[PDB]
Design a protein around this nucleic acid. Structure first.
Ligand SMILES: Nc1ncnc2c1ncn2[C@H]1C[C@H](O)[C@@H](COP(=O)(O)[C@H](F)P(=O)(O)OP(=O)(O)O)O1
Ligand SMILES: [Cl-]
Ligand SMILES: [Cl-]
Ligand SMILES: [Cl-]
Ligand SMILES: [Cl-]
Ligand SMILES: [Mg+2]
Ligand SMILES: [Mg+2]
Ligand code: NA
Ligand code: NA
Length: 326
DNA sequence: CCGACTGCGCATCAGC
DNA sequence: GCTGATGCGC
DNA sequence: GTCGG
């Protein structure tokens, strides 16, 4: 939290750009600058000092100079007092309502939690569930509950088939003391890049988790990705736990290392690492790392036997999950 | 200056 | 129905 | 909004 003030500011700016301006590159630029400043081991004394860091330019340096001198950013003060921006920023806090739907709702005069609630018939399924659990989804999950959650998921997956392997990734795998949700990487020997020797692999797991009342709602579901809602069981007389977001990703077993690298994150670490790969003439996704041809076309997938192999290709010293929280 | 900016699954919609 | 674009979120 | 060439 050395520079909590500055990173907060930049994060607020990134949000404004994504949510209100619908300017995706500015959003990514701001997140990048916030992230680099967050890891900088010194209390930033000036914009010029910040500007030394990759991803901080003249505009951000200037904002940092304003923020340091006054403690705030006029630009942000104004954004905050603007009803349309405020409203749009609020509606996007509901899962399933993004920048476009937010602006549409505000046009229609839907702009409060109350409005949303009385106009449920105007929401798609995802949005309806997001409204349902609006409060819960903004709560953090203590690692201690994540551990309980992990135990359930792992045991129920075992019950469906001992050959499944379920791994909890995301912030949990990076060692975080609290998580925004639970991310589960799933593999089965029957699903490889070579074939799918068994159908409903993901469905069967989802069903079992529903059967035991752990998964409570579904945001979306396909053959390889599930997005939904879950809840720990409480005890006699005890208040219930908040409902939690859960994501499950089924990945070809032979592509586990690329998959776990992807699902471990952080999102910015991934973006950073993937960008570096391109600079070294590779492209990395959750399945494969491939070379780029002179033309620019991705070539064939390279041999991968560990996460470190991936780092090796792009000439990065290996970084443990706990050190990928950018 | 200016092109490029990480990479992709699922839901929904237009156009055919 | 399909495909391809766009929204949303990982 | 930033950067590399
Ligand atoms: N934009 C992205 N680009 C690349 N990989 C991504 C991206 N977004 C997510 N992933 C990968 C890398 C992410 O780590 C992983 C899970 O995405 P979560 O949305 O659950 C989120 F970021 P987590 O890190 O888990 O933190 P918490 O959930 O707040 O506690 O998917
Ligand atoms: Cl932009
Ligand atoms: Cl401010
Ligand atoms: Cl792999
Ligand atoms: Cl691939
Ligand atoms: Mg997560
Ligand atoms: Mg997630
Ligand atoms: Na810089
Ligand atoms: Na949202």
């Amino acid at each position: 939290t050395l520079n909590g003030g500055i990173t907060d500011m930049l994060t607020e700016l990134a949000n404004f750009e994504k949510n209100v301006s619908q300017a995706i590159h500015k959003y990514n630029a701001y997140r990048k600058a916030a992230s680099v400043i967050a890891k900088y081991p010194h209390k930033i004394k000036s914009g010029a000092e910040a500007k030394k860091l990759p991803g901080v330019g003249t505009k951000i340096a200037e904002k940092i100079d304003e923020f340091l001198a006054t403690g705030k950013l006029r630009k942000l003060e104004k954004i905050r007092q603007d009803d349309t921006s405020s409203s749009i920023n609020f509606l996007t806090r509901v899962s399933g309502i993004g920048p476009s739907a937010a602006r549409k709702f505000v046009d229609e005069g839907i702009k409060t939690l109350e409005d949303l609630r009385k106009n449920e018939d105007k929401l798609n399924h995802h949005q309806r569930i997001g409204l349902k659990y609006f409060g819960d989804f903004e709560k953090r999950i203590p690692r201690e509950e994540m551990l309980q959650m992990q135990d359930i998921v792992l045991n129920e997956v075992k019950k469906v088939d001992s050959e499944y392997i379920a791994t909890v990734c995301g912030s949990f795998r990076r060692g975080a003391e609290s998580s925004g949700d639970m991310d589960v990487l799933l593999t089965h020997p029957s699903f490889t890049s070579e074939s799918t020797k068994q159908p409903k692999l993901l469905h069967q797991v989802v069903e079992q988790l529903q059967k035991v009342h752990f998964i409570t709602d579904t945001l979306s579901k396909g053959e390889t990705k599930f997005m939904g809602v879950c809840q720990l069981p409480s005890k006699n007389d005890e208040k219930e736990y908040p409902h939690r977001r859960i994501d499950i990703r089924l990945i070809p077993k032979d592509q586990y290392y690329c998959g776990v690298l992807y699902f471990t994150g952080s999102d910015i670490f991934n973006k950073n690492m993937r960008a570096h790969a391109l600079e070294k003439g590779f492209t990395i996704n959750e399945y494969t790392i491939r070379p780029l041809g002179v033309t620019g076309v991705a070539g064939e997938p390279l041999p991968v036997d560990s996460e470190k192999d991936i780092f090796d290709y792009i000439q990065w010293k290996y970084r443990e999950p706990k050190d990928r929280s950018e």
